[PDB]
């Protein structure tokens, strides 16, 4: 009955940690071995058998290895911001639409939206925390970037959002029923994955690591057990942000098998944009976000908000 | 009932705020009790729409003051005070033990959660903020909003000629 | 076309030369490609091209190489077929050696012969050059075919005349190979 | 190259073309962020090697 | 020199098996720390990451054994940045007297277990330039090194087969099976 | 049969040296043409939905 | 919520967990006075890290605060098209977002959007 009832959410949850943990593993194999064929090597082949368990051949070490205790830092803050930055990218699946309820969340595009803003945080105390040069320019490099896709991202959300007339993830599912919104808004979805990488700090937006212009960025000061969870906290984001792609653009028939061969493409897509854009200049983005972005997703709202008007109209 | 365990947190993170010195010691105070004040009013309301509000608002907010303490009060000190963590803990205890003890049917807000309404109240049955956020945008109320937009882009014409944005950036000189 | 800025003499090539139409026709398709992404389309469709190539990587070390008997590596005393050694000590390797790895001592053999009783070189401070094995007037020392000869001790790296030997005995078939396809040129 | 009639150079000084060029980033990259500036070490072309001699 | 067994002669002897310490182990917590200890060389074996250091004219060669011919990547070898993440240096060109204090607090800074490795005549023993009077002879004099690879450059082949002797020398690290005796 | 390595009787072919450009697809007029083109069903069998 | 909560602090004790065998399983070796030195490319650090780091996007910065305190008030829309007088909804909502553009388009104008130069 209703004591049974949240034994079962309790279980889905961590059926649901343990299988995004144990992907995000098994993601960053993939990527090694596509962006090893983008470029045309091989990739990872030889541990085990055939490469597959080079990412748990990985996860040994950076765990037999010690942890780094800076001269400068302040200890407490950087030994803790490794764990607030995976707690955030688990967290936030938890809002992830199952027609087998899992969370209830209406106002569940909101609950994005707070989530996605949380992570900042975690990468801005870390490299504050982390009190090196190359660290704070990392944070600072990372907090821009907020700035920039933060309140494009919202408008853009919003467009969607009329479409199917709630904040309620589920209804995604009964309008892209004959189709799918990725026809009606093909420079959405355009453009949406482009604000998509910046939210995970990808190339052509990898600022917050910066490498070859930062160091190693705010993780330049990580080792062994901290910097493995930022790294996971890392893929978690590419994994779920693909996943949001697939609800919106790709019918999200969440029970369908074929939902799930969408949702790796959509990972093969970031791992594939990664080998082939250079990386924009730092205020570059932020021009665009403004500039471009901010005003193109305005434009839309008019559109929609006709074309919602003119619907009602009729039905 | 977490309730009053959310009154326990808000009382002892208050008392530490007041003792903070460090921007950021301030600004972990107060991004924590950020989340407990977003949690303790959706408790006491029909949704928790105006928490996700809330809290994404104050965000945008902590994340602008993180840009200019870094910028002005980056080399400050922390203190790690005896007397105020075992002071917090003390009374943390002593709070969570009477929450336990209380009458915490008495200790519960009287404002109308949506269960707490009758079941005849036909308009409870629409969508989780329909009626509240309407006359938002109807006569004559809808006006209040014009002005704010107003208010909005005439502050925003404000910012940029209090700044002088052409005559430098900004240093701790 | 756009026309040319520079007018272009004979024997030069412009890089950034041709202007920009200002047609209708011309800046639609420039803000075609700037408004859908155009010019990061194609780029899309190279990239992806490669998966369906067969990746130039190769298996080693059960695949390796390609070499050519030119190859400069391991160093190697060799010797006559009588098994006599073939150096007499005349000391012009070390002579030219650049980096001055060569250090020889020589006496009169207890048969009267010109012979070494020193011949060490630093391989840490070779540079695998090759000019000993091109003043050598017998060919007594030649950089063998061998490439993988690292070590986890600095001191195993200074070979004395007893390892040098060695290696003109193991590699001794693979060297006397390459020396008659390669001895014309040289 | 300066010959003595010797068998051995008597000095041999050695232009690096980058030595003028990165003699020249001091400037060239004013007023300018890491960004640029990294991309304006690599269109310099210097091969280190030849700046030190 | 030991030299290898003839084809008859190796034809009786027995598969030589993965672990280096065997299965001969007496008591159940030996043999469980000895199996427990190839887990650990298995996982630092297979991710060896470098750390970019790329000095001189061997640096370019460091560069190719990344490229598609002969893909380090194959091997878990992932080049890194920062010395925090990364767990091998290869020292790879002229140490100088200028750069000497910087290696070594790179290295320094990375953490344990650290294996260095010398690539090319100039890291080895100073090579061309071993007079100079600039110039650290040999890269052992600053850092403790673990394999050295000869040439000038090594040849691309020549640094993989380093690389393969850092794996086999993780690989029969005994961490654990000392720490019983300890 | 050559004793040294020369170019071959009559010598090797033209190596091609120039750049050429890869298939063009899509002007302005097609690719915006399309565009609205697409949205419009789009819109029309939003509808229907 | 008191679903979510109560996830919320399960999911972080595993992942604090996490570490603590990370920290216990890691190899512990005696720290010297170089290796917790900071990292700044192998030579020794001229300047604090808590030196003030100048703004050029300070502008920018300010302008961000206000921007999301209209988004506050354009969500709202949707939840109450349904329900609301379609004129007064329709007026309001499109001189919401003209005045959004006209504000953007007259700073944009005005340069304010580009950095500190
Ligand atoms: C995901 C990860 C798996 C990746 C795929 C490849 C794995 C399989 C493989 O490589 O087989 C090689 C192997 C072929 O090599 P081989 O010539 O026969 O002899 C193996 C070694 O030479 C002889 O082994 P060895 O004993 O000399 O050295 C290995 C050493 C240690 O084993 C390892 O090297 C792995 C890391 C350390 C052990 C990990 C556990 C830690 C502590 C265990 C003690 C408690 O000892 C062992 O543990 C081997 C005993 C087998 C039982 C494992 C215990 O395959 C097999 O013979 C068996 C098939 C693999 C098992 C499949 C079982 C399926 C069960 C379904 C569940
Ligand atoms: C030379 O030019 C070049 C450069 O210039 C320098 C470059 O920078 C680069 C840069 C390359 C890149 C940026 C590539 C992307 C790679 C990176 C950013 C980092 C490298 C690391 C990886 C790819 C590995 C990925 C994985 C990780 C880092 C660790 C993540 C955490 C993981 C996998 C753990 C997951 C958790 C789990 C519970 C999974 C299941 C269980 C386990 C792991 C348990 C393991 C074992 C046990 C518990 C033992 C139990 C035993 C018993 C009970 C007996 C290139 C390619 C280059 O060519
Ligand atoms: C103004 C806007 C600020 C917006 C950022 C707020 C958070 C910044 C906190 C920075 C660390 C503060 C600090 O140093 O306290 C040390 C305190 C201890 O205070 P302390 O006084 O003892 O530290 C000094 C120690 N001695 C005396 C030895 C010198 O340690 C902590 O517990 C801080 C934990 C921080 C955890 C990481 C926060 C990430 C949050 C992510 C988003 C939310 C999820
Ligand atoms: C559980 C135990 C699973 C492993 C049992 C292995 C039994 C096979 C015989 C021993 C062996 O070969 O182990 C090593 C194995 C294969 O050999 P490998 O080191 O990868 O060399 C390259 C091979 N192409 O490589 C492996 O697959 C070992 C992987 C074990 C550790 C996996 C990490 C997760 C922790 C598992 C506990
Ligand atoms: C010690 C104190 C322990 C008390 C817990 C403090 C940690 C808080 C973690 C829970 C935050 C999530 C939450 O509580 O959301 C509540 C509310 C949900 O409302 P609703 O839309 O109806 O969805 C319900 C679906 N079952 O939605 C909201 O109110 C907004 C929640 C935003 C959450 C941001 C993520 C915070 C992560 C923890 C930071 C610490
Ligand atoms: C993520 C995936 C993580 C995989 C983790 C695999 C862990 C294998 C554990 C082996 C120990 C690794 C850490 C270590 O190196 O400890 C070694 C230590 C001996 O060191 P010591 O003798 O003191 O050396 C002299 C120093 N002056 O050892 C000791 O002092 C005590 C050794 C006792 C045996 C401990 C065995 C622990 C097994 C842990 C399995 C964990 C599984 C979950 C992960
Ligand atoms: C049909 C609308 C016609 C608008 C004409 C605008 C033509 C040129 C726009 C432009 O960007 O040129 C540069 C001009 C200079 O403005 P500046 O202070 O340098 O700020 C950065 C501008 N990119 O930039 C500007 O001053 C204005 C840029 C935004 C104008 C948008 C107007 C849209 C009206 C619909
Ligand atoms: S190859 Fe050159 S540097 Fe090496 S020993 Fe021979 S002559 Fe000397
Ligand atoms: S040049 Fe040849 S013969 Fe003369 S000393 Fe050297 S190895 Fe011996
Ligand atoms: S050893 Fe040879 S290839 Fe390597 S850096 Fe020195 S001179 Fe260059």
């Not at chain 1, 808004?185 to 690591?209: C, G, H, K, Q, Y």
């Not at chain 5, 061309?128 to 040439?151: E, F, L, M, Q, T």
């Not at chain 7, 010297?32 to 900071?38: G, T």
Request: glycine share 6%; aromatic share 14%; charged share 15%.
């Amino acid at each position: 009955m209703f004591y049974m009832e949240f034994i079962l959410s309790l279980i889905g949850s961590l059926l649901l940690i343990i299988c995004v943990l144990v992907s995000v593993a098994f993601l960053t194999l993939l990527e090694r071995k596509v962006l090893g064929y983008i470029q045309i090597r091989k990739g990872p082949n030889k541990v085990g058998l055939m490469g597959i368990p080079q990412p748990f051949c990985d996860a040994i070490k950076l765990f037999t290895k010690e942890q780094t205790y800076p001269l400068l830092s302040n200890y407490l803050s950087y030994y803790i911001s490794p764990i607030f930055s995976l707690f955030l990218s688990l967290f936030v699946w938890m809002c992830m639409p199952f027609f087998v309820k899992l969370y209830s969340f209406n106002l569940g595009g909101l609950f994005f939206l707070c989530c996605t803003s949380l992570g900042v945080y975690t990468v801005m105390v870390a490299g504050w925390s982390s009190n090196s040069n190359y660290a704070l320019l990392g944070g600072l490099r990372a907090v821009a970037q907020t700035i920039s896709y933060e309140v494009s991202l919202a408008l853009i959300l919003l467009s969607f959002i009329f479409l199917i007339g709630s904040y309620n993830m589920i209804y995604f599912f009964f309008y892209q029923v004959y189709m799918w919104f990725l026809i009606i808004l093909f420079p959405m979805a355009l453009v949406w994955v482009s604000i998509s990488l910046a939210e995970t700090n990808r190339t052509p937006f990898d600022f917050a690591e910066g490498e070859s212009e930062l160091v190693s960025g705010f993780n330049v000061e990580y080792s062994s057990g901290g910097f493995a969870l930022i790294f996971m906290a890392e893929y978690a984001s590419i994994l779920f942000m693909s996943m949001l792609f697939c609800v919106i653009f790709l019918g999200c028939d969440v029970f369908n098998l074929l939902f799930y061969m969408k949702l790796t493409f959509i990972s093969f897509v970031f791992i594939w944009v990664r080998g082939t854009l250079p990386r924009f200049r730092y205020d570059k983005l932020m021009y665009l976000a403004w500039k471009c972005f901010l005003s193109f997703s305005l434009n839309y709202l008019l559109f929609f908000i006709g074309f919602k008007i003119l619907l009602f109209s009729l039905l | 009932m977490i309730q009053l365990m959310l009154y326990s947190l808000i009382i002892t993170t208050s008392i530490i705020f007041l003792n903070m010195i460090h921007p950021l010691a301030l600004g972990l105070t107060l991004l924590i009790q950020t989340i407990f004040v977003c949690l303790l009013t959706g408790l006491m309301t029909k949704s928790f729409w105006y928490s996700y509000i809330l809290f994404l608002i104050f965000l945008g907010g902590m994340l602008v003051l993180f840009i200019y303490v870094t910028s002005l009060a980056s080399n400050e000190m922390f203190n790690l005070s005896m007397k105020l963590t075992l002071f917090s803990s003390l009374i943390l205890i002593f709070m969570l033990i009477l929450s336990f003890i209380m009458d915490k049917t008495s200790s519960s807000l009287f404002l109308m959660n949506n269960d707490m309404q009758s079941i005849i109240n036909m308009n409870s049955y629409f969508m989780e903020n329909s009626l509240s956020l309407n006359k938002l945008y109807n006569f004559p109320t809808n006006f209040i909003t014009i002005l704010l937009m107003n208010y909005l882009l005439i502050t925003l014409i404000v910012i940029v000629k209090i700044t002088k944005l052409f005559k430098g950036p900004i240093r701790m000189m | 076309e756009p026309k040319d800025i520079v007018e272009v003499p004979k024997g030069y090539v412009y890089v950034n030369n041709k202007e920009l139409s200002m047609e209708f026709a011309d800046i639609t398709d420039r803000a075609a490609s700037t408004m859908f992404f155009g010019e990061l389309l194609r780029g899309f469709a190279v990239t992806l091209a490669h998966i369906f190539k067969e990746p130039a990587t190769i298996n080693y070390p059960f695949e390796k190489g390609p070499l050519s008997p030119r190859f400069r590596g391991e160093h190697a005393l060799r010797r006559y077929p009588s098994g006599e050694e073939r150096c007499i000590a005349c000391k012009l390797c070390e002579a030219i050696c650049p980096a001055q790895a060569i250090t020889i001592e020589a006496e009169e053999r207890a048969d009267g012969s010109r012979r070494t009783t020193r011949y060490d070189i630093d391989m840490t401070k070779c540079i695998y050059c090759g000019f000993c094995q091109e003043a050598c007037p017998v060919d007594a020392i030649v950089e063998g075919p061998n490439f993988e000869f690292s070590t986890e001790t600095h001191e195993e790296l200074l070979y004395n005349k007893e390892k040098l030997l060695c290696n003109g005995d193991k590699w001794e078939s693979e060297i006397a190979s390459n020396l008659q396809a390669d001895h014309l040129y040289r | 190259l300066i010959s003595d009639g010797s068998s051995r150079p008597y000095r041999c000084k050695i232009k690096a073309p980058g030595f003028a060029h990165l003699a020249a980033l001091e400037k060239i990259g004013k007023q300018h962020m890491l960004a640029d500036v990294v991309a304006i070490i690599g269109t310099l072309d210097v091969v280190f090697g030849e700046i030190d001699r | 020199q030991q030299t290898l067994p003839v084809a008859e002669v190796a034809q009786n002897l027995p598969k030589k098996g993965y672990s280096p310490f065997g299965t001969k182990q007496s008591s159940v917590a030996e043999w469980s720390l000895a199996r427990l200890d190839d887990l650990l060389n298995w996982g630092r074996k297979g991710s060896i990451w470098p750390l970019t250091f790329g000095l001189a004219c061997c640096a370019v060669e460091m560069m190719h054994i990344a490229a598609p011919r002969y893909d380090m990547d194959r091997y878990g070898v992932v080049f890194r940045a920062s010395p925090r993440q990364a767990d091998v240096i290869i020292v790879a060109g002229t140490l100088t007297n200028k750069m000497a204090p910087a290696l070594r607090k790179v290295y320094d800074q990375m953490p344990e277990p650290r294996w260095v490795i010398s690539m090319g005549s100039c890291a080895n023993g100073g090579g061309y330039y071993h007079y100079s009077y600039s110039v650290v002879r040999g890269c052992d004099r600053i850092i403790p090194v673990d394999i050295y690879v000869p040439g000038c450059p090594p040849t691309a082949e020549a640094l993989m087969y380093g690389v393969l002797q850092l794996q086999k020398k993780v690989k029969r690290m005994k961490t654990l099976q000392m720490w019983y005796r300890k | 049969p050559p004793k040294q390595d020369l170019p071959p009787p009559g010598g090797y072919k033209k190596i091609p040296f120039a750049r050429v450009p890869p298939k063009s697809y899509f002007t302005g007029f097609t690719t915006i043409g399309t565009y609205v083109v697409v949205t419009a069903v789009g819109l029309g069998i939003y509808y229907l939905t | 919520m008191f679903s979510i909560i109560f996830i919320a602090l399960l999911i972080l004790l595993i992942t604090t967990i996490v570490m603590f065998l990370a920290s216990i399983l890691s190899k512990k070796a005696l720290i010297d006075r170089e290796k917790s030195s900071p990292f700044e490319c192998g030579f020794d650090p001229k300047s604090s890290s808590r030196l003030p780091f100048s703004l050029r996007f300070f502008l920018i910065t300010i302008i961000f605060l206000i921007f999301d305190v209209e988004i506050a008030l354009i969500l709202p829309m949707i939840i109450i098209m349904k329900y609301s007088n379609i004129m007064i909804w329709t007026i309001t909502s499109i001189i919401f977002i003209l005045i959004l553009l006209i504000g953007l388009y007259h700073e944009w104008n005005q340069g304010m959007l580009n950095w500190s130069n």
